[PDB]
Amino acid sequence: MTEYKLVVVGAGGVGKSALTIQLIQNHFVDEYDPTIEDSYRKQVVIDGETCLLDILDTAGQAMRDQYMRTGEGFLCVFAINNTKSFEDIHQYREQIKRVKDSDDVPMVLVGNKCDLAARTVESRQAQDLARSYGIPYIETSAKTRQGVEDAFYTLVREIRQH
Ligand SMILES: Nc1nc2c(ncn2[C@@H]2O[C@H](COP(=O)(O)OP(=O)(O)NP(=O)(O)O)[C@@H](O)[C@H]2O)c(=O)[nH]1
Numbered sequence: 546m547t548e549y550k551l552v553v554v555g556a557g558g559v560g561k562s563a564l565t566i567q568l569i570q571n572h573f574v575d576e577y578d579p580t581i582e583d584s585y586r587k588q589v590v591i592d593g594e595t596c597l598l599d600i601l602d603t604a605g606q607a608m609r610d611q612y613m614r615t616g617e618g619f620l621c622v623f624a625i626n627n628t629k630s631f632e633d634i635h636q637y638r639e640q641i642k643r644v645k646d647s648d649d650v651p652m653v654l655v656g657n658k659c660d661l662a663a664r665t666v667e668s669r670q671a672q673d674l675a676r677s678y679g680i681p682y683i684e685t686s687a688k689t690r691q692g693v694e695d696a697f698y699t700l701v702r703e704i705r706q707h
């Protein structure tokens with residue numbers, strides 16, 4: 546079946562793994578468990594198309610080049626209560642542009658942890674960035690499962706259109 550090679554990238558602690566497990570295992574991981582490299586396979590039906598999501602959950606901590614090269618779509622994740630993570634987005638996208646040799650790659654900017662009240666990054670600020678990159682912006686919470694399916698599915702739709 547049509548495979549989709551998705552890669553979740555972002556700074557440490559922004560909730561990359563949490564967004565992934567909530568999609569596959571349908572539950573929120575409220576524990577300290579830093580990722581080295583984990584891969585998930587799932588048969589799903591998206592817009593009536595039987596496809597398989599081959600998702601690679603990356604570490605937040607030269608070595609990235611390997612999986613960025615084989616990835617088709619990318620979830621660019623930052624935490625809305627962490628300005629540093631939002632700023633680190635630019636570095637990640639730059640390295641993806643470098644290893645892909647492309648200015649336009651299927652990509653979605655995710656603003657995670659939107660359930661928290663201690664926001665430090667305004668949604669307008671992130672939206673302006675997403676506009677500048679030419680990609681969609683979506684706010685999510687792995688805790689309440691808000692926007693989770695929205696984030697991953699939209700990414701698939703961007704690949705289909707690429
Ligand atoms: N309130 C809230 N907390 C969240 C959310 N998503 C993740 N967290 C939490 O924030 C922490 C970090 O989660 P984790 O998914 O491991 O982040 P990560 O970016 O994969 N870490 P790394 O890249 O280092 O392995 C956890 O303690 C976790 O439950 C969220 O959406 N809302």
Ligand SMILES: [Mg+2]
Pocket residue numbers: 561562563578579580602603604605
């Ligand atoms: Mg992780």
